[PDB]
C-alpha cells in the first residue's frame, strides 16, 4: 500500500493549459444551474433540487449549506465533492479562526480558506481537482454583505450577481438587465426566482427549488436569550411554503 502517488496529476500542457482544471470546469458546466444576487440589505443564493428518482426524498439532500451563522454556500458540479468541501469549510472556520479570535471569520477570509484547499488539490500529489464551482454568500460587521464565486483552480471573485453551471451564460445576461445598486432583498429574491425559471425544465415550485438568504439577524433562531450582543444567525433557508408564496406574486 501507501499512497505512492506523490507527484502532481495536474500539469501544464505545451499550450500552457492546466488540463485537469479545464476538465473540472467542464464538469461544472454540465452541472445544474445555481446563482446568487446581492441586494442592499441582503444576499440570496438559489438552485434547482434536481431529484434523481421521485422515490428520493430531496429535502434530505442539502444543496444550500450553512457554513457559519452568517455565511452560506451553494454549488454547481459534482455534489459529493461539494459535500466534503462544506465539511472542511465548516471545520476550517473554527480551527483557523474562531478558536483563535473567538468570533466567526469574515466572508472573504473563509472563502480564502476554501480556495486554498481547492488550489492544493490542483498541485498536491496523487489528487485531482474538485469538480465544483461554489457561490458563497455572507455578512460580517466590517465588510457588510458579499457574494463570492470559487472555481476548481482555487481562484475566487466578488460579484454583485452571477450564475454558474448549465444555463449560466443566459442567466448572467438576464441578471445584467435587472441588477442595480438599489435592490432591496425581496426584489433580489424575486429576480433570483425569475432567473431560475429559465433554466428549469419540469416542475418549478418550493419542493424543487432550494433557496437561502443572508439577511437580518434572526434572534428567534438563536436558541437562547440573555446575551444582548448575540443577536442570531443572518443565514436563513426559505421554506417550501415561503418560496410558493413568492411564486404567485411572480
Amino acid at each position: 500500500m501507501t499512497d505512492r502517488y506523490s507527484f502532481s496529476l495536474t500539469t501544464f500542457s505545451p499550450s500552457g493549459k492546466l488540463g485537469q482544471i479545464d476538465y473540472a470546469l467542464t464538469a461544472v458546466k454540465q452541472g445544474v444551474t445555481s446563482l446568487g444576487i446581492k441586494a442592499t440589505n441582503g444576499v440570496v443564493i438559489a438552485t434547482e433540487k434536481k431529484s434523481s428518482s421521485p422515490l428520493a426524498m430531496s429535502e434530505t439532500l442539502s444543496k444550500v449549506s450553512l457554513l457559519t451563522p452568517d455565511i452560506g454556500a451553494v454549488y454547481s458540479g459534482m455534489g459529493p465533492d461539494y459535500r466534503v468541501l462544506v465539511d472542511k469549510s465548516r471545520k476550517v472556520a473554527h480551527t483557523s479562526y474562531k478558536r483563535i479570535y473567538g468570533e466567526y471569520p469574515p466572508t472573504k477570509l473563509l472563502v480564502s480558506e476554501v480556495a486554498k484547499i481547492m488550489q492544493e488539490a490542483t498541485q498536491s500529489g496523487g489528487v485531482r481537482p474538485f469538480g465544483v464551482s461554489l457561490l458563497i454568500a455572507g455578512h460580517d460587521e466590517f465588510n457588510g454583505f458579499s457574494l463570492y464565486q470559487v472555481d476548481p483552480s482555487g481562484s475566487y471573485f466578488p460579484w454583485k450577481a452571477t450564475a454558474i453551471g448549465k444555463g449560466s451564460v443566459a442567466a448572467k445576461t438576464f441578471l445584467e438587465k435587472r441588477w442595480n445598486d438599489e435592490l432591496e432583498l425581496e426584489d433580489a429574491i424575486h429576480i433570483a426566482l425569475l432567473t431560475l425559471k429559465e433554466s428549469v425544465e419540469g416542475e418549478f415550485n418550493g419542493d424543487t427549488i432550494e433557496l437561502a438568504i443572508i439577511g437580518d439577524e434572526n434572534p428567534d433562531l438563536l436558541g437562547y436569550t440573555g446575551i444582548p450582543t448575540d443577536k442570531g444567525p443572518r443565514f436563513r433557508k426559505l421554506t417550501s411554503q415561503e418560496i410558493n408564496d413568492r411564486l404567485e406574486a411572480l
Binding site: 478558536r99 483563535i100 479570535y101 473567538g102 468570533e103 469574515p106 460587521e141 466590517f142
Partner: protein, 204 residues
C-alpha cells in the same frame, strides 16, 4: 526563583468617559539589583494597547509575537485589529502554552473604533480573561494597586481627571513595592488622540 517576581514591575489600566488609560513603571531588575530605568511595559498595535508585567524575556518575546500576529492580521483582514478581538488572540496564544507558560500578566486597553466603546481586560499567565468595567491591575505590586484603585476609582472620569487618578494609583502602589518604580508612564487614550506622559517619582 519565582519567575513572575525576578524582574519586577507593574501595569494598571482604567476606563473613563469616552477614554481609557493604561500606565506602567519603568523598572527592570535582577532581584535586589536595579538594572534599567527605561524598560517600558506598554506596547501598541494600531490603536490597541498591551501592557505586560512579569518575566522580562517573556514580556519582550510576547510583544514581538503580537506584533507578528497583528501585522499578518492586518494584511489579510485589510483593517486594524480591535481590542475585543485582540483580547481573544492574547488568550488563545497564552493557553496554547498551557503546560509551559509565559510568566506574564498582560493587560489590554483601547477604544473600539466602530462602536466607540472603551475597553480594558486582564489575563493570568495561562490565558484567563478578566473583562472589568472599572480597572485592571498586574505585577509585583498588584495587591497595592487593588487597594489604590478600589478607593481612588470612580466611573466616567474625564480624560484629564482619569490621568490624575491612574497616576496616583500607580505611583503610591509602586512606592510600597521594592521591585517597582524607577520611573513611570501614563497613556491617555481617546478615539483619535493618544497622549503619553512620563511621571516624576522617587528613584529608590
Amino acid at each position: 526563583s519565582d519567575p513572575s517576581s525576578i524582574n519586577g514591575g507593574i501595569v494598571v489600566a482604567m476606563t473613563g468617559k469616552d477614554c481609557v488609560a493604561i500606565a506602567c513603571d519603568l523598572r527592570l531588575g535582577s532581584q535586589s539589583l536595579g538594572v534599567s530605568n527605561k524598560f517600558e511595559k506598554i506596547f501598541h498595535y494600531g490603536h490597541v494597547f498591551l501592557g505586560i508585567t512579569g518575566l522580562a524575556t517573556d514580556v519582550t518575546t510576547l510583544n514581538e509575537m503580537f506584533r507578528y500576529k497583528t501585522n499578518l492580521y492586518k494584511l489579510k483582514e485589510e483593517r486594524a485589529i480591535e481590542p475585543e478581538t485582540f483580547t481573544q488572540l492574547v488568550s488563545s496564544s497564552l493557553y496554547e502554552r498551557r503546560f509551559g507558560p509565559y510568566f506574564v500578566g498582560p493587560v489590554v486597553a483601547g477604544i473600539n473604533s466602530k462602536s466607540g466603546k472603551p475597553f480594558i481586560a486582564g489575563f493570568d499567565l495561562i490565558g484567563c480573561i478578566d473583562e472589568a468595567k472599572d480597572f485592571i491591575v498586574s505585577g509585583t505590586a498588584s495587591d497595592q494597586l487593588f487597594g489604590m484603585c478600589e478607593s481612588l476609582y470612580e466611573p466616567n472620569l474625564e480624560p484629564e481627571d482619569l490621568f490624575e487618578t491612574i497616576s496616583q494609583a500607580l505611583l503610591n502602589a509602586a512606592d510600597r513595592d521594592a521591585l517597582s518604580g524607577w520611573g513611570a508612564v501614563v497613556y491617555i487614550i481617546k478615539k483619535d488622540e493618544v497622549v503619553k506622559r512620563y511621571l516624576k517619582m522617587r528613584q529608590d
